[PDB]
Short mmCIF file of C-alpha atoms in Angstrom, two decimals:
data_model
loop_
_atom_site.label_atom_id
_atom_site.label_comp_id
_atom_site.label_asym_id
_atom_site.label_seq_id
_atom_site.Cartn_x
_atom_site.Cartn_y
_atom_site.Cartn_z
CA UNK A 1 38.04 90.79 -0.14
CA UNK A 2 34.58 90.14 1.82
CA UNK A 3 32.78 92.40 3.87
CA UNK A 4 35.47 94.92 3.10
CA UNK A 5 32.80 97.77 3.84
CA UNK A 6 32.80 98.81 7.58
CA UNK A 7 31.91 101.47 10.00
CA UNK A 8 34.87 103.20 12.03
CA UNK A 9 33.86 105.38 15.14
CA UNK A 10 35.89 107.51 16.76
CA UNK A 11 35.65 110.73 19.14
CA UNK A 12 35.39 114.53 18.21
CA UNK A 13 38.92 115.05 19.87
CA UNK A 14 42.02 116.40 19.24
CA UNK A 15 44.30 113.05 20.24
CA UNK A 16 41.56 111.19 17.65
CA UNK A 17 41.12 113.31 15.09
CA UNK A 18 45.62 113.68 15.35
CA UNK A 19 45.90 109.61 15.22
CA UNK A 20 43.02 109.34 12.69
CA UNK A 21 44.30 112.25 10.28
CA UNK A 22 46.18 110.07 8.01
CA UNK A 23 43.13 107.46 7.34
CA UNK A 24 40.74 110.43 7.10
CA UNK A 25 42.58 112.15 4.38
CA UNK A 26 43.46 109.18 2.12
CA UNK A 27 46.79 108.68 3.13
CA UNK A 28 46.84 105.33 4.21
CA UNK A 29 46.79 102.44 1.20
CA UNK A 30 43.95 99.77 2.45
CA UNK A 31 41.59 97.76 0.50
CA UNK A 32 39.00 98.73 3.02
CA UNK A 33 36.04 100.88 2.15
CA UNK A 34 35.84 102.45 5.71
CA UNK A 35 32.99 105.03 6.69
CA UNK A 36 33.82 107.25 9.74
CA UNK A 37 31.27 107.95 12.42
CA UNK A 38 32.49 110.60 14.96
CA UNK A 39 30.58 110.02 18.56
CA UNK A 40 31.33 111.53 22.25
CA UNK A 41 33.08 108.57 23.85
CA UNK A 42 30.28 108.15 25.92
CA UNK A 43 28.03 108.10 23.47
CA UNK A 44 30.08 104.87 22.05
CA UNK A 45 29.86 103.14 25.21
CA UNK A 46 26.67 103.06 24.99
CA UNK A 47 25.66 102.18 21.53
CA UNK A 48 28.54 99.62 21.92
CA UNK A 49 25.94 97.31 24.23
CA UNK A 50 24.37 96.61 20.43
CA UNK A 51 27.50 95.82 18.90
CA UNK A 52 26.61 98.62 16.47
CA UNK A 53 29.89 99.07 14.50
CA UNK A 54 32.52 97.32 13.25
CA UNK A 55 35.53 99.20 15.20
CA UNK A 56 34.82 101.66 17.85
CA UNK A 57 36.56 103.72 20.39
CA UNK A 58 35.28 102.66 24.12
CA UNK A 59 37.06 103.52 27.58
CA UNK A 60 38.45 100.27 29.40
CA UNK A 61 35.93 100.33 31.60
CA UNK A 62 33.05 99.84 29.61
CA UNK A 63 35.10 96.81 27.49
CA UNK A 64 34.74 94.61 30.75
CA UNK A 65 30.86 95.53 30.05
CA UNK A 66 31.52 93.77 26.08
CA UNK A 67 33.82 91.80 25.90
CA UNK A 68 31.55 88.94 24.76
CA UNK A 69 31.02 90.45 21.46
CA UNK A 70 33.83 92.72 21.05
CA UNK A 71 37.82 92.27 21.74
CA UNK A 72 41.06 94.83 22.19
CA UNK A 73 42.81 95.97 19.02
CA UNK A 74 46.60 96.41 19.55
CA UNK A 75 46.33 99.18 18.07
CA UNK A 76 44.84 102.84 19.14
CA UNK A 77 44.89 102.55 22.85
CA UNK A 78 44.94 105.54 25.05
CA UNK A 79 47.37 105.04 28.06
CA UNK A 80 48.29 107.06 30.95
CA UNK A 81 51.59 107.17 32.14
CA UNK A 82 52.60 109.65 34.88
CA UNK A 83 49.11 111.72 33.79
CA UNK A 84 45.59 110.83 33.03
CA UNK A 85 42.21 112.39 33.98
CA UNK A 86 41.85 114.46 37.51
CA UNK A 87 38.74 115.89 39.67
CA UNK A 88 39.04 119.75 40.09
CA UNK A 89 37.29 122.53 42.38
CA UNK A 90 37.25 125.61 43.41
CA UNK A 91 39.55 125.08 46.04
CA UNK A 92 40.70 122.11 48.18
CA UNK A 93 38.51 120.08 49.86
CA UNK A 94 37.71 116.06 50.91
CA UNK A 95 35.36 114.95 47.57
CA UNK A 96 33.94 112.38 50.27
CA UNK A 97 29.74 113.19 49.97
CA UNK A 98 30.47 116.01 47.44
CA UNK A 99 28.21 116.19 44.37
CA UNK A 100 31.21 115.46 41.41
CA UNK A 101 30.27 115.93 37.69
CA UNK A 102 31.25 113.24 35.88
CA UNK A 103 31.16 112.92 31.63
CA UNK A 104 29.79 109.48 31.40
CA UNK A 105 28.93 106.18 33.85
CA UNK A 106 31.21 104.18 31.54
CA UNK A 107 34.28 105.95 31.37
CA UNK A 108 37.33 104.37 32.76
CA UNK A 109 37.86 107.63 34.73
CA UNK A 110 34.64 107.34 36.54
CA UNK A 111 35.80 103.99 37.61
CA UNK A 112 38.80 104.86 38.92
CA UNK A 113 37.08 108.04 40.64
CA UNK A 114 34.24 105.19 42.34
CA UNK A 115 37.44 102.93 43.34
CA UNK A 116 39.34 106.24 44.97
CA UNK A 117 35.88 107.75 46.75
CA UNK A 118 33.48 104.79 47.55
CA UNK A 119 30.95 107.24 48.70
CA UNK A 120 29.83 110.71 46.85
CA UNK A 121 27.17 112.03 44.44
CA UNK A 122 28.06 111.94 40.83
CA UNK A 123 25.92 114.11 38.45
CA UNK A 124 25.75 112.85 35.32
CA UNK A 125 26.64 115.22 32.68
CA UNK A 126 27.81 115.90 28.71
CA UNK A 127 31.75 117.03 29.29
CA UNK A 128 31.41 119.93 27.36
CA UNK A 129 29.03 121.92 31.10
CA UNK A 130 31.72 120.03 33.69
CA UNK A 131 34.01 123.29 34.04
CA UNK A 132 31.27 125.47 33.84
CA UNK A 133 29.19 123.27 36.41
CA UNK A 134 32.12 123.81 38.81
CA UNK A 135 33.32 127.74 38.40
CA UNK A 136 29.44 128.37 39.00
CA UNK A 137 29.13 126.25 41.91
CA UNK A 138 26.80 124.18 40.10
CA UNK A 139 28.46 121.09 42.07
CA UNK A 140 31.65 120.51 44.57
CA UNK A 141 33.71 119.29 41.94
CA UNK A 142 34.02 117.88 38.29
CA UNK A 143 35.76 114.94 36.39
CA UNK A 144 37.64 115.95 33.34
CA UNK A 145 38.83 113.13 31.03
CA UNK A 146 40.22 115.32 27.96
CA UNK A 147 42.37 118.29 27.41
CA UNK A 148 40.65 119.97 30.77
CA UNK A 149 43.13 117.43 32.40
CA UNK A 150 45.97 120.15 31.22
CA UNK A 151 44.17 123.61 31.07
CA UNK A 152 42.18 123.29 34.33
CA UNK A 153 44.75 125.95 35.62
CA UNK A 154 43.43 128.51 33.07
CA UNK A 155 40.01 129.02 35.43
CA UNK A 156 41.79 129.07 38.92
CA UNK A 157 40.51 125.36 39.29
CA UNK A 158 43.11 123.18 41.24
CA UNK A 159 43.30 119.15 41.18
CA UNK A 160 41.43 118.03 44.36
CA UNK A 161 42.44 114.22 43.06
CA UNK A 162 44.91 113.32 40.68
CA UNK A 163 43.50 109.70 39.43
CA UNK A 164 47.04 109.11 38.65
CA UNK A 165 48.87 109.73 41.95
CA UNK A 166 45.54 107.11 43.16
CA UNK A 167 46.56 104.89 40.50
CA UNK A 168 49.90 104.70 40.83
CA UNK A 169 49.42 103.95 44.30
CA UNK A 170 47.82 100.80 43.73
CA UNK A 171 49.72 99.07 40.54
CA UNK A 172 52.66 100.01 39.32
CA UNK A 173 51.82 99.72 35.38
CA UNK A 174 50.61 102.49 32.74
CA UNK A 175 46.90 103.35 33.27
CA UNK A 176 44.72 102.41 30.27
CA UNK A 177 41.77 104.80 29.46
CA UNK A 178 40.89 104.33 26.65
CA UNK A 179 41.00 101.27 24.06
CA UNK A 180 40.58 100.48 20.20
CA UNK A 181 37.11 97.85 19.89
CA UNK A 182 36.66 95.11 16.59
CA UNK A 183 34.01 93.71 16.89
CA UNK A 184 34.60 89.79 16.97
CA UNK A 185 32.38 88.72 14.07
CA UNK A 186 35.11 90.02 11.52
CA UNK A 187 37.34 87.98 9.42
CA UNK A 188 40.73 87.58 10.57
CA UNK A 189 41.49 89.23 7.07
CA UNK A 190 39.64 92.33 8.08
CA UNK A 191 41.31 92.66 11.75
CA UNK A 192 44.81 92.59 10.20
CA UNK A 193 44.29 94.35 7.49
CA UNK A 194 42.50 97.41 9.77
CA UNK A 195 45.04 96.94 12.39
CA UNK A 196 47.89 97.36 9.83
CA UNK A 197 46.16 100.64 8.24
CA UNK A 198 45.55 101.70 11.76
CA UNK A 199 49.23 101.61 12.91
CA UNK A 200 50.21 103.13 9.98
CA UNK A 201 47.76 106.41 10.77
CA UNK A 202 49.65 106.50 14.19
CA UNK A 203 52.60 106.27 13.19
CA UNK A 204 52.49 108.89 10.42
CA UNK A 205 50.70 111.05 13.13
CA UNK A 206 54.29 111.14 15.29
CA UNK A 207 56.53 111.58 12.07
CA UNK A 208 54.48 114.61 11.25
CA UNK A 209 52.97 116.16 14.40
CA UNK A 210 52.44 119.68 12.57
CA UNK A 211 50.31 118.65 9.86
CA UNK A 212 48.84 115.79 11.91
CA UNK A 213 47.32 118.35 14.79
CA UNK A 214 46.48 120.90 11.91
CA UNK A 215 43.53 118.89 11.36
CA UNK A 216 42.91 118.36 14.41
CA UNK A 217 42.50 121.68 15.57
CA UNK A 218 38.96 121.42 14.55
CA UNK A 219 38.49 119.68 18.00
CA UNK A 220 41.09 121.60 19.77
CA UNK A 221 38.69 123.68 22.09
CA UNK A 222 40.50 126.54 22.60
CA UNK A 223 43.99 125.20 22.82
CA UNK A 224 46.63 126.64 20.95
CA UNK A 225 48.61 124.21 18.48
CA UNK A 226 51.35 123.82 21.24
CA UNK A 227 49.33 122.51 24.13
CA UNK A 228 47.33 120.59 21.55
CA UNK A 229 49.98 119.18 20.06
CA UNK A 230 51.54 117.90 23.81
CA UNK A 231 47.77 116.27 24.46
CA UNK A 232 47.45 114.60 21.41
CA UNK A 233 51.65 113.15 22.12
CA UNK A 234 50.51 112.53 25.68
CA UNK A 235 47.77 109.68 24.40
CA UNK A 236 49.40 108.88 21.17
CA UNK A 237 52.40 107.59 21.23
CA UNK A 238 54.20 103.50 21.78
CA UNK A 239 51.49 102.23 23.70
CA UNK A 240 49.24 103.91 21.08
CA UNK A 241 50.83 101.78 18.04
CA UNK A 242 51.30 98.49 20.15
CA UNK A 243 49.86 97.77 23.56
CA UNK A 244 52.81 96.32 25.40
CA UNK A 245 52.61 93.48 27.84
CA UNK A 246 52.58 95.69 30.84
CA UNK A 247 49.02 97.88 29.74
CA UNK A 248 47.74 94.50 29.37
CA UNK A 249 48.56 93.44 32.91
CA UNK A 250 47.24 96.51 33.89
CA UNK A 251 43.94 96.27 32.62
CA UNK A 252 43.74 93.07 34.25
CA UNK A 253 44.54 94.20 37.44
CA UNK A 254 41.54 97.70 36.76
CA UNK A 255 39.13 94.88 36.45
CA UNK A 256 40.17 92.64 39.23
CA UNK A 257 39.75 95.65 41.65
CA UNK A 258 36.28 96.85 39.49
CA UNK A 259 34.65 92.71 40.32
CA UNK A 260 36.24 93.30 44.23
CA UNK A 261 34.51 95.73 44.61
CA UNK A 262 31.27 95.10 42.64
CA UNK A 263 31.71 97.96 40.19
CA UNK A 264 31.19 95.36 37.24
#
């Protein structure tokens, strides 16, 4: 067992830290000496460009940006499916020339947000100042890729866009956000052997849900274990374990419209 020593990264997240809980704690078997590096996702899009660790978490949008050096793992995929990340305000209004907040350049929801509004401002911004940035009038309107997707309610924000409805309207497939990276330089003995201990984290994850999203209440931001326990089931889950064949057409299809349109 060669280069058996590598560097996971993952996100400070509930739906991570839920699908991750079993590896972190020693509950998955592997002959893998694995060191875990916990990044905001955007943060990993970036330092992905160097090809810096061995797996990483990366939204799909920033994968067409790496390919070359890194490919998709079946496993640990984020997919959207009737859901996914939204653009809230104040009240209604058009987003068209409005100043939106958005987490990172890189994310897939910022694609989909430039593919549904060809034309506004968006303020680039850590996640954790979007909702403040909006109740404060900071900006028109902000971009929420995690649990503010589901709580946005809570402040008397209202979806503006729904990058799902959008979505939907163009493809009819799940919407992949974001996606499990190994690096290509690793033996094939390595990418089975992490893929098999990664399945095996999901999958434990479902069959125990409780102790699973006890953990992961460390990243839960205010949610109580219920809602936290629907976001981390709402990104972990089937396509999670095994991307099907229909995520994969769908990705294909997010990048064909991302080159139309010279987002790429």
């Amino acid at each position: 067992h060669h280069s058996h020593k590598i560097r996971v990264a993952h996100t400070p997240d509930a739906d991570d830290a839920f699908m991750f809980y079993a590896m972190t704690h020693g509950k998955v078997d592997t002959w893998l000496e694995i060191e875990h590096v916990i990044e905001d996702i955007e943060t990993l899009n970036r330092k992905a460009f160097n090809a810096e660790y061995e797996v990483t978490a990366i939204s799909a949008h920033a994968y067409a940006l790496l390919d070359d050096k890194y490919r998709i793992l079946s496993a640990g995929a984020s997919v959207g499916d009737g859901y996914g990340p939204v653009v809230v305000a104040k009240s209604e209004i058009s987003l068209d020339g409005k100043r939106i907040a958005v987490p990172g350049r890189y994310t897939t929801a910022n694609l989909l947000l430039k593919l549904a509004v060809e034309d506004f401002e968006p303020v680039e911004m850590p996640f954790d100042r979007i909702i403040q940035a909006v109740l404060d009038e900071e900006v028109d309107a902000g971009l929420l890729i995690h649990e503010g997707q589901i709580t946005y309610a809570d402040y008397g924000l209202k979806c503006v866009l729904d990058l799902w409805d959008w979505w939907s309207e163009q493809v009819k497939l799940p919407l992949p956000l974001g996606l499990n990276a190994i690096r290509r330089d690793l033996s094939v003995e390595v990418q089975e052997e992490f893929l098999r201990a990664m399945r095996e984290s999901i999958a434990f994850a479902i069959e125990n849900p409780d102790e699973a999203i006890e953990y992961a209440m460390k990243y839960s931001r205010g949610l109580d274990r219920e809602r936290a326990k629907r976001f981390a089931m709402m990104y972990v889950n089937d396509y999670t374990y095994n991307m099907p064949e229909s995520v994969d057409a769908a990705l294909k299809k997010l990048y064909e419209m991302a080159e139309a349109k010279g987002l790429i």
